[PDB]
């Protein structure tokens, strides 16, 4: 971390194998942002010209490396995780005859006057070796190191700069080598025996191709409103006028979670770990209410044969709230486990138990043979081979009628049968979800209630973003939610305090860029549509505004219009013919002022 | 003589504050751009 400099129009590389000619290609990839900070390494950083060691640097979604050098002091890079021989690492070294790239379980030994030596003498369980002409060969020796989709992609470019240590020009890096490694590369280190390190981020760039297959210019679409305009129009020259290029939103600063302060835990233990189980034709239905629906207990009780949810994901049950948790507990033959599901056809679906097709819930099966499989077996079993008609969803027929044939069979299973016949205990949890009207909710840590700010909120399972304020609406004790003329939620009742809160949407609007034209000036003004200038200034100070660029926004260049807040133009009392329209009587123009 | 000038944030109407939806929306190509230009052209026409 010796020093920091700014990259200037540098680190662009060819994103793909496609040749393009005289086109402007708008693409999204991992790039070094323009004018971003790069760490300048003061030879060897912490290390001196010839010292024992140097620190390891982060490898955050790819690294840009550059160094103008004639002595070839930098002769390699190491990529890896722990770099202590417990995890495989990637070593790229140049001996000025060939470049050797290897992946092995390497031990770092502080490998680097008047001395040269071999490095990384401990190299166990080697799995990959590659040899090629040297990477390195006034010369910038620019490289981009990216590791995506298994492959470690290395790009490079060499330039002849005599008068500058960090050139101010533009060039694109060409792909050099692309290796199928499949290694994590959380962190990396440069091997010496001066250099700049930047990091890549997801970005969209407009790349200008020449008549030949080469990139001659590029614009970073997120650097400045002028670049965003250029990307929107896909041109490097912008004509005079006002353009709509993006939208702005105010992001939430904090998240709040509010659920009823219920400490009763749901009796999943008694239902799953039951002494006795229901027969096949007559499932035992219980109801779970006014409790915390903590589902980690099911995983704590037993490894499962199957845990398949249809209307919900098994991971997310501890985030959701439920209105009707019902638990149907029964024991079936293993070969029937796959048949208890929505939309299935067979003897169990039709004669013993049917599920609805619009089913929200989970079916959990666990082999119970350790308890239920005996030579005499468990005589709780009562399968129904024949039923006069198909069973309706959630219907249960306790009474047994003899067909004018004895439909019900009570047979225990021996431990010697194939597992498809051995009993499994199955619990079906029915989860009706009706937009957060109820007290059953998975375990979550409640937070404080934050008003008059743009926040994320979770109210009894209702998830959203907005500004919460004191409500003046007169809800009846029964009513919990309010909606406007368009069925958009605009009010909630706090589950712990029963306070009525109004939800106002967080500020949002269009962004227009007022450009004199790039043949006159690169100065632009930005209009935030439909917003107060106070709200915009607060969003800038709080780092909440979605677009990452900022307009200088100094005193007397912020003007409130009916169209919106105009930042980057000085309002004057001298009228003129309209040039670039803004709206509601207000126009903007590029003029000579005061001198 | 004139019509109310409207503007629609296509992504925020279809995929309001949802990254997953926005990424799925990208597979339909430039429909949001065509709608945005059509509404901008209408907005300009009303002032004309």
């Amino acid at each position: 971390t010796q020093s920091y400099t700014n990259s200037f129009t540098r680190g662009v590389y060819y994103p793909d194998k496609v040749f393009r000619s005289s086109v402007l290609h708008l693409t999204q990839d991992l790039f070094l942002p323009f004018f971003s900070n790069v760490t300048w390494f003061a030879i060897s950083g912490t290390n001196g010209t010839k010292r024992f060691d140097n620190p390891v640097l982060p490898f955050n979604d790819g690294v840009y490396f550059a160094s103008t050098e004639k002595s070839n002091i930098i002769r390699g890079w190491i990529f890896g995780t722990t770099l202590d021989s417990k995890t495989q690492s990637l070593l790229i070294v140049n001996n000025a005859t060939n470049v050797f790239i290897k992946v092995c379980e390497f031990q770092f030994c502080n490998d680097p006057m008047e001395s040269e030596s071999g490095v990384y003498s401990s190299a166990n369980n080697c799995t990959f070796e590659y040899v090629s002409q040297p990477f390195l060969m006034k010369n910038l020796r620019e490289f981009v190191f990216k590791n995506i989709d298994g492959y470690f992609k290395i790009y490079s470019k060499h330039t002849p700069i005599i008068g500058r240590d960090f050139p101010q020009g533009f060039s694109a890096l060409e792909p050099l080598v692309d290796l199928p490694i499949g290694i994590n590369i959380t962190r990396f280190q440069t091997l010496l025996a001066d250099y700049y390190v930047g990091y890549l981020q997801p970005r969209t760039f407009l790349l200008k191709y020449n008549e030949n297959g080469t990139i001659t210019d590029a614009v970073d679409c997120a650097l400045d409103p002028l670049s965003e305009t250029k990307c929107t129009l896909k041109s490097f020259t912008v004509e005079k006028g006002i353009y709509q290029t993006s939208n702005f939103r105010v992001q939430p600063t904090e998240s709040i979670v509010r659920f009823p302060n219920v400490t009763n835990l749901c009796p999943f233990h008694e239902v799953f770990n039951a002494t006795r189980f229901a027969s096949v034709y007559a499932w035992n239905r219980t109801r779970i209410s006014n409790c915390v629906a903590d589902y980690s207990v099911l995983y704590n009780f037993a490894p499962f044969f199957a845990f398949k949810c249809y209307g919900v994901s098994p991971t997310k049950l501890n985030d959701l709230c439920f209105t009707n948790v019902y638990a149907d507990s029964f024991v079936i033959k293993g070969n029937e486990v796959s048949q208890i599901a929505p939309g299935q056809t067979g003897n169990i679906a039709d004669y013993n138990y049917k599920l609805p097709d619009d089913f929200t819930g989970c079916v959990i099966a666990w082999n119970s043979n350790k308890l239920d499989s005996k030579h005499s077996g468990n005589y709780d079993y009562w399968y129904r081979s024949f039923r006069k008609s198909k069973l309706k969803p959630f219907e249960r027929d306790i009474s047994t009628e003899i067909y004018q044939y004895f439909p019900l069979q009570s047979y225990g299973f021996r431990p010697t049968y194939g597992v498809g016949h051995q009993p499994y205990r199955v619990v079906v949890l029915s989860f009706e979800l009706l937009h957060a009207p109820a007290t059953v909710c998975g375990p979550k840590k409640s937070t404080n209630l934050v008003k008059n700010k743009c926040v994320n909120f979770n109210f009894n399972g209702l998830t959203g973003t907005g500004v919460l304020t004191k409500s003046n609406k007169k809800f009846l004790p029964f009513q919990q939610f309010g909606r406007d003329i368009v069925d958009t939620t605009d009010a909630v009742r706090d589950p712990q305090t029963l306070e009525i809160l109004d939800i106002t949407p967080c500020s949002f609007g269009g962004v227009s860029v007022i450009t004199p034209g790039t043949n006159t000036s690169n100065q632009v003004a930005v209009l935030y549509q439909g917003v107060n200038c106070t709200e915009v200034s607060v969003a800038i100070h709080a780092d909440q505004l979605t677009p990452t660029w900022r307009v200088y926004s100094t005193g007397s260049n912020v003007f409130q219009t009916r169209a919106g807040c105009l930042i980057g133009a000085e309002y004057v009392n001298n009228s003129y013919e309209c040039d670039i329209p803004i709206g509601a009587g207000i126009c903007a123009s590029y003029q000579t002022q005061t001198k | 003589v004139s019509m109310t000038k409207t503007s629609v944030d296509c992504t925020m109407y279809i995929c309001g504050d949802s990254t997953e939806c926005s990424n799925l929306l990208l597979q339909y190509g430039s429909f949001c751009t065509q709608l945005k230009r059509a509404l901008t052209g209408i907005a300009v026409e009303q002032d004309k």
Partner: peptide
């Protein structure tokens, strides 16, 4: 006879003001 907070229809739908105000049209 004929009848900046986006109180209604806050679903990505906005209304832009006209370039000429009612006063300018009256002028």
């Amino acid at each position: 006879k004929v009848t900046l907070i986006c109180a209604q229809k806050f679903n990505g739908l906005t209304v832009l003001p006209p370039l000429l105000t009612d006063e300018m049209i009256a002028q």
